[PDB]
Design a protein around this ligand. Sequence first.
Ligand SMILES: [Mg+2]
Ligand SMILES: [Mg+2]
Ligand SMILES: [Mg+2]
Ligand SMILES: [Mg+2]
Ligand SMILES: [Mg+2]
Ligand SMILES: [Mg+2]
Ligand SMILES: [Mg+2]
Ligand SMILES: [Mg+2]
Ligand SMILES: [Mg+2]
Ligand SMILES: [Mg+2]
Ligand SMILES: [Mg+2]
Ligand SMILES: [Mg+2]
Ligand SMILES: [Mg+2]
Ligand SMILES: [Mg+2]
Ligand SMILES: [Mg+2]
Ligand SMILES: [Mg+2]
Ligand SMILES: [Mg+2]
Ligand SMILES: [Mg+2]
Ligand SMILES: [Mg+2]
Ligand SMILES: [Mg+2]
Ligand SMILES: [Mg+2]
Ligand SMILES: [Zn+2]
Ligand SMILES: [Zn+2]
Lengths: 97, 38, 177, 261, 162
Amino acid sequence: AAALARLGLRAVKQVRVQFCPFEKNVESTRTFLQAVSSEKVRCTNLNCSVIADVRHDGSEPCVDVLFGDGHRLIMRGAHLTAQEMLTAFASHIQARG
Amino acid sequence: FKTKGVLKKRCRDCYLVKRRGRWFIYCKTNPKHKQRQM
Amino acid sequence: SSFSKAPQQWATFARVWYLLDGKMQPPGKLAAMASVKLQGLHKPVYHQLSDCGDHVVIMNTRHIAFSGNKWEQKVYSSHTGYPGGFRQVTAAQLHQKDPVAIVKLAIYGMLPKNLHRRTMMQRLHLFPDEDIPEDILKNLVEELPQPRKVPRRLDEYTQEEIEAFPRVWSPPEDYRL
Amino acid sequence: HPWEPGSSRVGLIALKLGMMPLWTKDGQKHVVTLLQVQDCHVLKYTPKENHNGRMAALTVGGKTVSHFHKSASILEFYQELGLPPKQKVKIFNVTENAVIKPGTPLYAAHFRPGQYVDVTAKTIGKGFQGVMRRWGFKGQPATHGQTKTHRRPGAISTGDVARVWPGTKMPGQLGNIDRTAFGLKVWRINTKHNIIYVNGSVPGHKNCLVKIKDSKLPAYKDFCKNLPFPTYFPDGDEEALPEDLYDENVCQPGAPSITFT
Amino acid sequence: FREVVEILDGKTTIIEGRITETPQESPNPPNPTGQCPICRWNLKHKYNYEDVLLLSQFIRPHGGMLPRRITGLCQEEHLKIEECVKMAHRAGLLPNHRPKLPEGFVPKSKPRLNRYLTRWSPRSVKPIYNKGHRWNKVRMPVGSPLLKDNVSYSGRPLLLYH
RNA sequence: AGAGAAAUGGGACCAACCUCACAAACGCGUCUCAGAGAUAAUUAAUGAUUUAAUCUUAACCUAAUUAACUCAUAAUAAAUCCAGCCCUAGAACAGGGCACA
RNA sequence: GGGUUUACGACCUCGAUGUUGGAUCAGGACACCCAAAUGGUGCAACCGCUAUUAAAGGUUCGUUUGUUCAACGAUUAAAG
Ligand SMILES: [Mg+2]
Ligand SMILES: [Mg+2]
Ligand SMILES: [Mg+2]
Ligand SMILES: [Mg+2]
Ligand SMILES: [Mg+2]
Ligand SMILES: [Mg+2]
Ligand SMILES: [Mg+2]
Ligand SMILES: [Mg+2]
Ligand SMILES: [Mg+2]
Ligand SMILES: [Mg+2]
Ligand SMILES: [Mg+2]
Ligand SMILES: [Mg+2]
Ligand SMILES: [Mg+2]
Ligand SMILES: [Mg+2]
Ligand SMILES: [Mg+2]
Ligand SMILES: [Mg+2]
Ligand SMILES: [Mg+2]
Ligand SMILES: [Mg+2]
Ligand SMILES: [Mg+2]
Ligand SMILES: [Mg+2]
Ligand SMILES: [Mg+2]
Ligand SMILES: [Zn+2]
Ligand SMILES: [Zn+2]
C-alpha cells in the first residue's frame, strides 16, 4: 500500500478484482485487493473506481486495470504471489502514465 | 563520510551495508550520518 | 648390467627431459617437483658435487592457478638500484605482463641458494602455452603427473552421473525460481 | 601499396649545413636549420618477423666515403649491393606497405613544405666535463672564505646509507651521445640542392650526419596522408618540381615587402 | 516450478503464471529420521566447493542462493553451502548459472585468472605490500573457516591462512 | 566547455644580440617536450542470501572515475683494414674522415 | 600506536664517533602546504571548515639577529 501511495496513482481510471472467495487460490488476489483498496490509495486519487467482483463458480481470480492512457493491464492471478503482482502493477503504472 | 572505529545508526533511516570489504552506515535523509568502518 | 665402463657411466649420469602441464595447477606445487627434478634429488646416485640435473619443460604457464586471493594479494618487489626505483607489482599484474615470471620466480626461490642455482635454472624451460619447439619436443622422455586434481565444472558432468547423484530435497511446486 | 591510417614512412640521412633566419607573413622571425640530403640510398630490408614482429626495418645510408678506409665485410656488402660505401647507416621502422626496394635513392622532396619531423643525431661532445657544466649544479661562493671548492659537487650521499646511489650526478662525459629533437616544422624544400629547412635547432655540430624521419608525436600521427607514401619518385611524375617549395606562411625572398592594413 | 510470462497483444498486457513439473527427493535416504536435508542424507562434513552436483541443487538459475525457509537446511549447513557456492562461482565452476547478456558477451575483456578456494571477493582485497617478518607475518587466507569441521582422512588440519 | 600566452624542469643549438683581439665555447639569446591501460577514495545499472529493496570480503558482464606504474612509440642496434695525417672526437685508450677539390 | 622535544639509564666508543648554524648535493616517510579525484557541512556564490585516496613534481626573494626559531616587507599554486 505504501509503495502504491508513493507512486502517484492519479493516472488510473478503473481497477476491478474479480474472484471467488470459496476457492483455494484466492489469497494472493484478496491481499492484492486489500492493498490496492487501502486508505492511502483512496486519498491519493479519488477519480479511480475500485470494484471487487465476488462470484461463486468463476474459479479464476483475476484483476483488470483500465487507465487513462487507453491502457488495459489484465492479470489472471492463479499462482502469482501478491508481492509479484504488486511489483508488476507498480512497474507498469510507472512505465505507462 | 566520517571514518570511525565503531559505527552506530544516528537515525532510523540509516542502513548498514558491506562494500569494498568495509562496513558503511549510509543515510539518504541526513547525509551527515555517513560513517565508514576503519 | 654387463656394460663397458664408458657406456655404463653415460647411462648412469645421463640427463632426462621431463614434461609438466601447468594448466589449472598451483605454481608452488609445480615448483616443488620442478626443483626436485632440477637438483636431481630423484636419483639414488645424487650428490651435491656431481652435475646430476635433469631438464624440466613446463607448459601452459599462462593457464596457471592461484589458491585463495593470492592473485590480488601476493606482491613481487624489485629494485632497479637507483633512488626511487622500488617497484611492487601484484601477482595478477606480473602474470599479465610476463606469463612465465610467476613459476620462474617460484622455482628460483625453491632451488638452493648456491651458485649451482643459475646452472640448474638454465636447464629449465617454461612456455606460456602448448607451443614447444620440435627440437625440445623430441627430447622429452616422460610427463610428470599434475600435483592438483582439476575438478570438473557442472557442464563437464555426464548425464549418467547427474542422474545417479540423488536430489537431497524437494522444492515446492508453488515456488518460482 | 596505398596509404593506410596506421602507416609509417621511411626517413633520410642528411648533412647539417647551418642556420638561417626565416620570416613569416605575420612578421615573426624563426630560425631554420639546413639539412642537405647528399646520397641517401636504401641499402637493405629486414622483414617484420625477422626484425621486430611489429614493423619492418629499412636501412638507409648517408653520404659517400672512400673505399680505401673500410673493412672487407662492409666493402663486400656494398659491392654486392652495387653502391659506393656510405658514412652513416641507420635503421627506420616502417610498415609492411611502405617498404621500398633496397638500392633506391631518396631525395629531400620526400618531405613537403609544412610538416613536422624528428631529427636524431650525436650532439656536440664536450668531453669529460665538470658537475657544474654537466648537471647545472650551483657552486660555492667565490671569495667569502671558501678553500679549493668553487666548482665541487659538494655532498654526494648521506652518512647513514654508507654508500652513494647509482643515480648520483657526478663529473664525466658530456655530449657525445645520440639525442632526438621532436616536432621540428619544415618550412622550405630546395629541390635543386636537396635541402630541407627544419624549424629550430638540430642536435649535433655542422657538417654532421642527421637522421630525419616523420614526427612520431600523437598530434601529427595522421599527417602522412597527403605526403608521397612510398617515397618521392622524381621519374614517376615526369614533371620537374619547382626549385623551392615554401610553406603557406613563409615570406619568400621575392615578396611585395608585406605591409599591414 | 512456477514461471511468470508476459503477453503483449495490442496495448494489452497479460501476466500469467505457469506451473511445470519439478523433480522430487530420492526415495531412499540413508538416514530418514534426520530433520535436515544434508544431515539426513549424511553429507555433513562431506561436501566442499568442488561438489557442484550438490551445490547446484538449491540455487537460482542466475547463481543466487535459495532461502533457508524454503530449502530446509540447518543454519550452519546453510552458511557453509552459501560460502561453498560463492567459492565455486569464483573458481569458475557452474558456468551456466549466469545471466545471459548478448550485448555484454561481445566486448571481451582480459582473460579470467584461474583460482580456487577463494575466500574474499577479487574486487575488495588490497595487496599486502609489507608482508610482515617471521614473528609478525601477514598470512593470506585460503578457503573458509566454516569448512574446518570437514572429515580429514590424512589427519592433518587444513591450512586456512597461507 | 572553448582559445591563447608564459614560467619551471628535461634535452639540445649559435641565424641574430650579448661575452667575444682563434675559425670556437658561452647566456643574457633560440628550438622542442607526447598516446593507451591501470587503479585508491568515491558514484550509479542488474540482482539473491533476506522472491521487496541493497554498488557485490554474492557470482555475470557493468559504466564515471587521482597520482604513481607499465606499454605503445623514440634512441643504439652493417663484427676481425687500420701505419701515419686531420677532426666541430677526445685526459690515455677509444671514435669520425683522408678520390673528386 | 610513533619515537620529532626535554628528561631518565649509563649499553658502544676517552691508544679521539670533530661539536650549532649556514653554502653544495640531497635520499626517504606521510601524519599532504600546492597541484589531482571525492564525502559531509550551520556548503546560496566568491571564500571557507573538516574527512577519505594519492608522495611522479614543487614548496620564493629580502631587513634585523651567529642564530634553528621569531617579528616584519613584497609575492606566489603553495612557501608542509
Ligand atoms: Mg670535443
Ligand atoms: Mg657562482
Ligand atoms: Mg680559512
Ligand atoms: Mg680560492
Ligand atoms: Mg687553508
Ligand atoms: Mg650500508
Ligand atoms: Mg627550456
Ligand atoms: Mg529484487
Ligand atoms: Mg536505489
Ligand atoms: Mg618500452
Ligand atoms: Mg676509423
Ligand atoms: Mg632519533
Ligand atoms: Mg625513561
Ligand atoms: Mg658505559
Ligand atoms: Mg649498571
Ligand atoms: Mg670518548
Ligand atoms: Mg684506533
Ligand atoms: Mg630531497
Ligand atoms: Mg594519507
Ligand atoms: Mg588541493
Ligand atoms: Mg616530495
Ligand atoms: Zn541517518
Ligand atoms: Zn542440519
